[PDB]
């Protein structure tokens, strides 16, 4: 099943960065917000190694620059990530 | 020992015949298992995502029914690649759309209230509908 | 023994696979990844090799990349605690390659043969065996990429002839003409382009993106990598859909957004210029041999991004046929590796015939309902078995009628056996136990079992043809099961369960 | 003729020794069952495995 | 529950040189019968007794 | 077990009862199950029933 | 039998293999059947001097 949970994960990454029509974004409580339960009831959980922060450019990781997550114990999309050097 | 080489001649080409059987079953055994296993992973994984479906129902009924009009705009990836993320697998909605409309799946469709989600010949949570 | 796996290394191509049985395979890494690449790393006391090693590259000291150009050459790379030479550096490129292939197979391979370009010679091909025996696997032989992947699909059935490659490296560019010595590979010329491939690919699609997008809203692309990436992605999805695709378009939205209907022949005026930096290399090859595009018995499609339609619309009116396409190009070095690998430390000659079954074969139920034990398709030389019991009390001997094809029906069915066995013991139904092996030689003439277990007292049958006929006749048949769609109304006969009386 | 099933492989455990020992002879019935015995491998055993 | 004759004990021949082989072994059933096959009790053996 | 000379269970010494469980369910008559009475010097007697 | 220590498994019928894998291993008995030189370790009942 991790097959839904990598090739989703630029439209949850997509929803995940963007968190008087100043009101309608608080409807984000439930969808992008709500696949994180629902894809974290399969088993979902999202030192740096081994590409793990996937570094687009001291040794530790510095932030997060597009997020991913392990199936638990398993990888199918990677993560980016920027270093300081 | 004289015909006796004669004799273990025999024996060996006997236990080529007997070899090359000994084979030819195996090949076919071997080649066999496919059919078998090929359909074995096929059942293995039309169904099972259910789960990652049934439970994602909720956040695509939010992100298939919830100035910023640019903000508005951008949900076209996340709701085109999260029913797009739904399709080389298979869970579709419903799509009947004002017909007999089958109960469990005068008297036409006029509106339908949640959105369908349904892998591979199964049906996974109804539509409450007009 | 053990059987000689392949590992090919490609310069950001690369893959190491076998053969099991009679099906050729392409191993996977320990990366989710159908093939994981050639470029390492090293830090303290502990190694960090491919696409592990690889993206702690932008963030580390230690990332070599594509060292294809150093093997053969006096190159010596100064690094941490100890300057370092190709082969030791490929030692563990294949150290790595060989604990994969390891917690792959379990059965471990020693043994092995690699893959190396046709043009090599002395030096660097000799730099092959050497550092493919530095990681500890030894090599059996060095094929070279082009004689390889030829072999892989395999020519020496066939007559003497003439070829040419093609090669798409991973940004380079190869194609090699070949021969046939009747049993023999000499590969005669070579050309290419050192860079030119899939990702410059992606690049020009970036390219004309980019631009367009500052062709409207003015705001420039390439300043954001995320943004970048999303788009070397994006971008891929497009390319490879033009190459299968009649029409795009591609969802990149939520940008910053760019959605617009990705079109085939744009991307073609986009992409037919260095389909001519090829028509270069593969023509100046018609020289190097001397042959015109008219002197060749067949040719073929090469490497990762030679998936889409560009290429082959500039060779089918270019030598005037098309390509052997019989592969998965992307890993077809690999297998070709190994080909021969079990061609000279194991099997030898095969038929590989009457690798299937006429029909399901089964039996005579409660009064004719039938019964599969074999199916159709199956390979022959096999025997299924299985045991039924009592008819009703008593029965004091049984009769046994087995048919052959598929509708479950007596006479909607070929009576294939008749013949009976006596002297049960007498006692309730259902009890008794008696066997029948179908028992299915290789050759065709099937023989029967069914004997008592209490008794040991048993009956079999030699039958004759078994078919006896013709293809067409059997496949109107095997249609006709179709043909029928639900004469299963004789679940009517499955209610006949009131055959139970209690 | 008919159907019911005849446990096609007949079961066992390792038994002590390295061994195996058949619980059930192979072609049998529709479900059954069976019942042994065995004892400590060597001097005060505090535990058994069964594989 | 009801009983079912037994065959108290079980029977069979002598088995050459010399033996006793089981044929029905003991606690059986009611009717019941089985079979088996051996071979002559010497080279071209004259004849064969059954006891 | 009863225990008299007369023909019906009603007639007899009621000396205790006891069950048994777990034979495969299987049709009537099939199985066999194997009572065996023993008497030791005493006059106590002992009941067993075995499948 | 005396402690009345009940622990025990259930095994699910999955990974054993009953397609052709029984009818081949069975004729692994037959060709193999020499097998009885089992007793080796019957006569390893040498550690059972204790």
Do not use: W
């Not at chain 1, 100043?22 to 992008?32: A, N, P, R």
């Not at chain 2, 017909?99 to 006029?110: A, C, G, H, Q, S």
């Not at chain 3, 004997?451 to 049958?461: A, F, P, V």
């Amino acid at each position: 099943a991790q097959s839904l949970a990598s090739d989703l994960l630029p439209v949850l990454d997509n929803f995940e960065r963007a968190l008087q029509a100043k009101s309608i974004l608080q409807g984000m409580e439930m969808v992008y917000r709500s696949l994180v339960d629902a894809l974290k009831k399969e088993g979902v959980e999202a030192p740096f190694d081994p590409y793990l922060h996937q570094a687009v450019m001291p040794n530790t990781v510095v932030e997060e620059l597009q997020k991913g997550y392990k199936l638990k114990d398993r990888v199918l999309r990677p993560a980016m990530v920027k270093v300081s050097q | 020992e004289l015909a006796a080489a004669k004799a273990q001649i025999a024996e060996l080409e006997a236990k080529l015949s007997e070899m090359e059987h000994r084979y030819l079953r195996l090949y076919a055994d071997f080649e066999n298992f496919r059919r078998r296993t090929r359909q074995e992973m096929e059942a293995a994984e039309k169904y099972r995502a259910q789960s990652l479906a049934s439970d994602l129902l909720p956040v695509l009924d939010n992100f298939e029914r919830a100035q910023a009009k640019s903000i508005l705009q951008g949900m076209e990836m996340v709701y085109r690649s999260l029913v797009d993320a739904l399709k080389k697998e298979g869970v579709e909605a419903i799509e009947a759309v004002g017909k007999p409309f089958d109960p469990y799946l005068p008297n036409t469709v006029v509106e339908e209230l949640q959105k369908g989600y349904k892998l591979k010949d199964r049906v996974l949570r109804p539509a409450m509908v007009k | 023994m053990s059987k000689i796996i392949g590992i090919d290394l490609g310069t950001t191509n690369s893959c190491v696979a076998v053969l099991e049985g009679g099906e050729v395979k392409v191993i996977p890494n320990p990366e989710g990844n159908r093939t994981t690449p050639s470029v390492v790393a090293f830090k303290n006391g502990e190694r960090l090799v491919g696409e592990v090693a690889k993206r702690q590259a932008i963030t580390n000291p230690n990332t070599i990349i594509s060292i294809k150009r150093h093997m053969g050459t006096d190159y010596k790379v100064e690094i941490e605690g100890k300057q370092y030479t190709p082969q030791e550096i490929s030692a563990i490129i294949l150290q790595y390659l060989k604990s994969y292939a390891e917690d792959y197979l379990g059965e471990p391979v020693t043994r092995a043969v690699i893959t190396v370009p046709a043009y090599f010679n002395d030096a660097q091909r000799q730099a092959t065996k050497d550092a493919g025996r530095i990681a500890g696997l030894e090599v059996e032989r060095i094929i070279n990429e082009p004689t390889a992947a030829a072999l892989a699909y395999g020519l020496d059935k066939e007559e003497d002839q003439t070829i040419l490659v093609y090669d798409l490296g991973g940004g380079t560019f190869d194609v090699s003409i070949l021969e046939l010595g009747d049993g023999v590979f000499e590969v005669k010329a070579t050309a290419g382009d050192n860079h030119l491939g899939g990702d410059d690919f992606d690049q020009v699609i970036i390219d004309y993106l980019v631009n367009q997008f500052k062709q409207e809203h003015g705001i420039d692309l390439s300043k954001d990598k995320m943004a970048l990436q999303r788009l070397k992605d994006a971008a891929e999805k497009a390319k490879k859909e033009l190459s299968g695709v009649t029409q795009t378009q591609i969802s990149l939205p939520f940008i910053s957004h760019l959605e617009m209907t990705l079109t085939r022949a744009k991307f073609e005026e986009l992409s037919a210029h260095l389909v001519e930096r090829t028509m270069g290399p593969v023509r100046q090859a018609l020289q190097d041999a001397g042959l015109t595009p008219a002197d060749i018995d067949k040719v073929i499609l090469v490497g990762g991004s030679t998936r889409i339609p560009a290429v082959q619309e500039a060779i089918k009116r270019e030598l005037g046929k098309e390509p052997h396409k019989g592969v998965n190009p992307d890993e077809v070095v690999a297998i070709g590796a190994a080909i021969q690998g079990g061609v000279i430390a194991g099997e030898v000659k095969d038929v590989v015939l009457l690798d299937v079954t006429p029909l399901s074969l089964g039996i005579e139920t409660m009064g004719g309902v039938f019964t599969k034990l074999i199916e159709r398709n199956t390979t022959i030389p096999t025997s299924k078995s299985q045991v039924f019991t009592t008819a009703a009390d008593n029965q004091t001997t049984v009769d046994i009628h087995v048919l052959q094809g598929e509708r479950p029906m007596a006479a909607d069915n070929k009576s294939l056996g008749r013949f009976q066995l006596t002297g049960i013991p007498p006692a309730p139904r259902g009890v008794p136990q008696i066997e029948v092996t179908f028992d299915i030689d290789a050759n065709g003439i099937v023989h029967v079992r069914a004997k008592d277990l209490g008794t040991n007292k048993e009956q079999s049958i030699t039958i004759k043809s078994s078919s006896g006929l013709s293809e067409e006749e059997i496949q109107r048949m095997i249609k006709e099961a179709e043909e029928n769609a639900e004469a299963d109304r004789k679940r009517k006969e499955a209610a006949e369960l009131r055959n139970e009386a209690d």
